RNA sequence: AGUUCUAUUGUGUUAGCAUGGUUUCGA
RNA sequence: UAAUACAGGGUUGAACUGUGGGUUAGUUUCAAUGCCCAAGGCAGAGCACUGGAUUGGAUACCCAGGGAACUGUGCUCCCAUUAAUAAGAAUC
RNA sequence: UUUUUUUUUUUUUUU
RNA sequence: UUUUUUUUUUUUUUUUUUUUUUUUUUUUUUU
């Protein structure tokens, strides 16, 4: 005995009333004169947050078991970014472990089977290592050897 | 099915009494529709204590012996119990076969790597 | 009751890639635009911009 | 380094959606807009005593000075709606029991963070806003004061 | 990497996604989605759906748009009624 | 084809240790999973670890 | 359908009960009593046969006495003179230090 | 870990506190009760000092509650100088 | 007919958006003679499952109270004229299952057929 | 059974290391056990409290250690971490070398033993680049050197 | 020049005040008499630290006080 | 001054050590009573049985180690109240078996010359004996003939054999 | 849900063995 | 509760089966301790019982001795009656 | 003398 | 009564599974 009713008074149904519905009781039984904000509000009523929040969902976490694989092919990503707060190996969305996996997840989507997307990532990574990164070091690099200012010979 | 026997002499026991010891267990083997697979040894082994068998005196070490036969699963208790009266013998123990753990097609990298 | 005939979730699915002769599920994200509110947040500043109306909150 | 429970299910908020922000702003002008063209308006900026960034005036107007005894839950900001018009909350999972009867407009500024684990700030919130990096409220308004 | 960077992609954009086309999963009576026009209730709006196996618009389509639209626009409640489609492309 | 699931309900009973001071159990030992347990793979996201055997074959 | 599912049943099992073979082959190998014994009993058979012929007496006779013979001197090879003491192997291997 | 020969079943408050690791009341059930709000009305209960009730309206236990009021308070100030504009702005 | 009341549970809920319900020929022409009255947003066979909305109206919902009237193990049978006496001065929806189908009370009286009280929907005392 | 050696030690130091050993494996727990003789029941719920009271004690004695730990050190941790907070280098003086390109205007706004060190010193630098002093000094430029030269010509 | 790009700000580094430990909560009377144990093997006291990371349980005789709230309201009022 | 971490943990965070790690899988063959080599790390000053927050093993193994351990101790082939000694640190086969399998390892290291005399004698006494390590690592001494066709060819420019190994992308 | 096969076994029964507290003996 | 023999239960893989079920007398097994009967013995314990303490007026509390009771294919279920205070279906 | 008790006794050993 | 040594008889739970880690997944309105 006592709060023995699943489906009853225990789940109260009280129905949500804003104060442009409260105010215009009020001011129609004589209770309370209407005040000059009393219009403003009623062109513009504010918008309905009760029935918003319905439509939250709760999705599986599919990186905890995708970032697995990443990891043991290829374990020399705990390494880079390992001083910086947040990143854990006892990750930040910055950190390569989360950037890699994400394409492979966006990738699935058009159609991709799973061991399709890893090939695509991988290949799709290599390129930016070898021409963007490779490019950039070496492209610098050979400005220093211009640097021969300092040899008597130079003059 | 098979089966397999881990028996650990003494050093009062010599050649002749080993080839008695198995000639006579064979008997059991062949009177169960039986039959022998293989006779190895293990050579001297240490012991962690001293092993004070009644009757038999005090012993620090002995020759290890194994033996994998098959026959009938009611013969093991007359095996066991035959063990226990001869002389010698002072201490056994009967051990399955498995499939893949046994000391035939399982003797090689153990120690090493 | 195995032989039965009920409309599931598998089942319409299959007829439906049936006719694409060998057109596959597809999703869609969320349309993120930066002029949705950059363009929009100047116009609600000049009904604040008054110095006697922010010059006393953000003193 | 973390002993505690890894989470699995990551839930969805979409109270702060982007696309929602479109219309919350919409709508929301449009009720500013109609209140300013009356005279003799004022408004009310509630905050926190962590809020440093957001200067505070000595003396508040309203406020109410009660005992423990006979504290049942009391209205502080009872005598709120005769001076005022309009308040602007930005701590509304603390300014939670005062203004739930409040018989002026609310636009409380709040985080999903709060939102999705103290859903009870909706119902006292009638007009929501939006807050862009949802961190702090002190730093929060006054970018978008000061903007370009 | 950087947020700031050009190709950036935020991990949590992506894991949300979610199939335009299923948002019309309930309809109204009947749970083999096979009628040419359906109708969700709603307060004040009137939805309606056209779902097809190929988009084409026969007699029997008709008929049953005929009557949701005027037993949508006689209903006082309903100031202004919706319409949109169902097939991917089409 | 369309086939529902079947009662939970199975023959025997709940685990039973004897009384006094000769500890035994009556109907079922401690290695007992009950009709309504979750599935293993939620009760054991771990899985086999990097050292484990990968054949149980004993 | 239910009959082709047979044929495929029928392939499984067997690739399983390939496999056992295997396993029972390495014993047979690995053993050497079981060859000893095997080798010395067709010895005799022949012997028994091939001296009947020449003396002209039953075989029935011969086999037998020989038979009885076989299992007194079986244990004759063993044990392979295993006298390797572990613990006087292993001291001089490096692997341990006491006397 | 030792064998137990036995098991206990309690039904009092009183022991259930001791023998079972706690008795922290968990979240409840959505689907049997409601989530519990901070807007709920107040339990009705007298206020009471001694056994003296108090219903008019006109040194070391303050010590403590300073050391934890102050001294904690002030160290979060510190988190928030080097973030707001001494050097989230340059 | 045991199906049937299992439903009244799952669509009894405040705080939530969609139900399942075990899927029955007899569930499925219940939903929709309720949907025709707006109790229901929409439904769908999910194959072993039926998925159920709800819905919502400034935060209460639409159904408050349910009352089964009919259960397996008997059997509530009305006359036409004793109907009426029972259902009156009431907003209350009773499902009535006539000869003829499923219906509501409103069309039994109509037609003076004899149905079967099988459960109300949105009924007081 | 715990036997120990007293090497370049007083007794009273050696003592303490034996007195503890016991504790361990419970030596004077099961010494008086056995002394007296304990009824059946009591064991049943002797051995089901030891169970909830045990588990407790190590959480308490960890937090006890990082009081001590944090007493020494003081500083507080607070809710500091936010996703939107990008740990940039503070004032973040090393960068790449100039292409040459930013290398002309710096002497355009600094020509005035101080500050004129920097001249006749960077000049000459762009003199030898081009090629007007050393035949051999003359370099490439960066229009020539990435177009057919690094993404057709590579190794691989 | 190959630096790290990123200030090193990890909690390994600079040591906190922090439980990186989950634990259900306790009674207070119950773990009231544990903590003199240990500090009878030989500022604030232990017992009100631990008070303010909520892990002690909400007993009969010991309650959580409330947030302060009449000291802690600052309003500013601006015309509109 | 690292940080101090509780002893007390979830079974889901387990760090062993590298010398144990290796020990548990043992060529992924469930440990018996026959290795005696492996079963002196799971016990303690006065022999008893280890818990399992102690050396760290999973659920299905921790059974089957205390098995082997209790079954060595009854053939009085372990110790009973301290730990094993290093006469006893073998397991249960052919002692010569255990000589040849120890040369093997050294040859392997750092490449003993006196173990590779020892085991070619061997070889020729002891037929009936496993060579198969022994024999694979001299088999794989083919590199050091191949080598010396790259150098002939080298002479005449022959520079194409490294282009190609090279030319992987 | 149930039958067959395969991996897994501190669940029921079980005569000899090993170790151990107490007890017992004194070429 | 290491070894071995007989036969159950639980988890996973394949095949088969194609509604086989929930509860349960005029029913049937098992079931701590105590008691009758029976078998028994040579250890460790102890009810009754004259064996060394009581009082500020009465006692079994604190030692020691001590022939019942402690292994059963049996007679047999009185209790604080053996893994919560529901044997099933539906909503996560 | 030994054993035992808050304390003590009974009991046991005899050069 | 203490210590030491070398084989009689009865009996068999000390060591060995565990932070109660599923949407925390469940216990009864009020004082």
Redo the contacts between chains.
Sequence with gaps: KGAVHYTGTNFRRVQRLDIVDRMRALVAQGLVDAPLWLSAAERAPPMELSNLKLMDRKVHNKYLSLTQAVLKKYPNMRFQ?????G?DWSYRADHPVMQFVALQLRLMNLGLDRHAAFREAEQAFYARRMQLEKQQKLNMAAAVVAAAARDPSAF | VFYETFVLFSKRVQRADIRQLLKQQEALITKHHGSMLAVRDLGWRKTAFRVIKPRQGIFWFGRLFYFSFGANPAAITEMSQSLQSTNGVLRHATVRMKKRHNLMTYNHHIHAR | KHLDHVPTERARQLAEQRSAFEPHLRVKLEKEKFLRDCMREQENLAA?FTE??KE??LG | ?????IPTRLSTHYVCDPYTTLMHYRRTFKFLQA??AKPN?????????N?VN????KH??G?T??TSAVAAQSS?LSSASVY???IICLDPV?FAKHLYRINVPVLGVCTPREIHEHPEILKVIDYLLPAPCSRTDAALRQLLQREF | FFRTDPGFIDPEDVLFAEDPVRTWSHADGGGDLAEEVLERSNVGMGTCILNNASGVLNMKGLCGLFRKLRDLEVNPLKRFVVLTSRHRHF | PVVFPHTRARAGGKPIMMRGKSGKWHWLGPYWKPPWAPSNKARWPTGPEEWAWSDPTR | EKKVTQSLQTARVSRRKVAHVLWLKKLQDSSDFLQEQEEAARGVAALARARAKETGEEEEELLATEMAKLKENAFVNLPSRNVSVPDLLAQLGLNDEKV | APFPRGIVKPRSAKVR??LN????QRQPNPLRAPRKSLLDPPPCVAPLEKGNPKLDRQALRAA?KN??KK??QESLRHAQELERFYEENC | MQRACEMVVSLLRVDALSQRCPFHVLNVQILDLLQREGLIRGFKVDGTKIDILLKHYKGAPVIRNIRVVSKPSRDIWLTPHELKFRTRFNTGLWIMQTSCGVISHRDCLRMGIGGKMLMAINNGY | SCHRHVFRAAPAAVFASVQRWGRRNNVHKLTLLVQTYEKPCVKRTRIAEEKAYYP??F??????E??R???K?H???GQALDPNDD????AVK?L??PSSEERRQHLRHMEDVKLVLDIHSTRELLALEEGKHARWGKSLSEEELGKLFDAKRLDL | ?N?????????????????????????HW??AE??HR?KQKE??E?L???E?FK?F?ETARFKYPP?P??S????????? | ?P?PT?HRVHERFWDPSPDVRVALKNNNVPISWRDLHILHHFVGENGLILPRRTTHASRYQQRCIFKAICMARRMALFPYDWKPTQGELMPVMDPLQYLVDELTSRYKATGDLRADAMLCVMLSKYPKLNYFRYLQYKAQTQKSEVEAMQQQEEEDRGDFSRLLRKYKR
């Design positions: 970014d390992c001083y910086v707060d990143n | 604040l006697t109306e006393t909150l | 380094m973390n002993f505690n429970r209140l300013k308006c004022r408004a009310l900026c509630l905050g926190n005593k809020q957001i200067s505070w005036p508040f107007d406020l000075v009660v502080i005022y018009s309009l603390l | 506190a001791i690791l706690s008795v922290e403590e050391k934890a001294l904690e | 407790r004690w959480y308490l004695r960890y937090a006890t990082v009081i730990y944090s007493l050190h500083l507080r941790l740990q940039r280098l503070d090393p790449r070398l | 020049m630096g790290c790009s990123k200030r090193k700000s990890h909690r390994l580094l600079k040591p906190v005040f922090e439980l990186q430990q989950s634990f259900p909560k306790i009674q119950q773990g544990i903590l240990l500022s604030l232990a009100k630290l631990l303010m892990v349980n947030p709230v009449h802690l309201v600052r309003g500013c009022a601006f015309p509109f | 001054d940080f509780p």
